Design a protein around this ligand. Sequence first.
Ligand code: ZN
Ligand code: ZN
Ligand code: ZN
Length: 178
Amino acid sequence: NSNICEVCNKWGRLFCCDTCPRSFHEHCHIPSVEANKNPWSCIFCRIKTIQERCPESQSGHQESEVLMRQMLPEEQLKCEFLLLKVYCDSKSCFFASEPYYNREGSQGPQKPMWLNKVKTSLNEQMYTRVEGFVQDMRLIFHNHKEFYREDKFTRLGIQVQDIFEKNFRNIFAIQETS
Ligand SMILES: [Zn+2]
Ligand SMILES: [Zn+2]
Ligand SMILES: [Zn+2]
């Protein structure tokens, strides 16, 4: 197994995957690493297993179809992985915890959103469709772009949103387009 956390890349109290070499802090893994279970498979392993069980799940899809899907256990997992992949980027640290807004010439967003809030929402099963998860994810970056305006700090929003969108297309097998 790896000696660092796959998500944050630090050492510490790590839990090791029994089916691949990745390791996780308890709360870096989404969902949080499970109390017992021997062996234990990580979320990278569980996502691979869905794909292997239905190779046609990697033929292309329409985003509109994807969003209307109900949050049954496989869609739930896939959003928990998408979220995980965003937290793998160190720049996710700017979007993790609840923000606040006090900048001359800007008003704060009507509906603030942050990654830990999206994490809690998933955990408490508050999304019924993929749509709900993907709207909040996108809201994070949109709020950021609107608030920081012409400041160069807006670019962090663009960057982390590009990580979200590439990963969403991949995980949900969106049909490739030019
Ligand atoms: Zn970690
Ligand atoms: Zn694994
Ligand atoms: Zn099949």
